[PDB]
């Protein structure tokens with residue numbers, strides 16, 4: 744139900760941020776709970792209106808990484824955050840890459856809502 748969608752927002756959605764620098768990743772990766780116990784190595788924050796993002800679920804089906812056919816593609820502004828390797832928990836550190844790019848998301852439910860950030 745809601746819980747997976749809620750995890751998607753928390754992990755991957757930040758509409759009004761310009762993002763795109765390391766202080767952003769460093770700040771948001773801890774604020775959004777991806778720094779507890781261990782550092783998450785890679786994460787994408789989508790800088791897009793939530794309803795616009797949900798609109799991607801209504802486009803044609805394509806194949807997910809794992810095999811399934813409930814994935815959808817859209818182009819959105821993101822900040823990708825990658826762990827620096829010097830980084831060690833609990834003080835996680837990240838490098839930011841800002842770009843507008845194609846993402847792939849898995850949707851499920853009625854109505855269809857984003858549930859996993861595929862690619």
Ligand SMILES: O=c1ccn([C@H]2C[C@H](O)[C@@H](COP(=O)(O)O)O2)c(=O)[nH]1
Nearest residue numbers: 751754785786787858859860861862
């Ligand atoms: O190009 C890629 C490839 C992999 N991931 C990572 C980010 C997500 O945190 C993870 C999948 O997270 P779930 O939403 O599936 O839990 O895959 C990306 O962000 N971008």
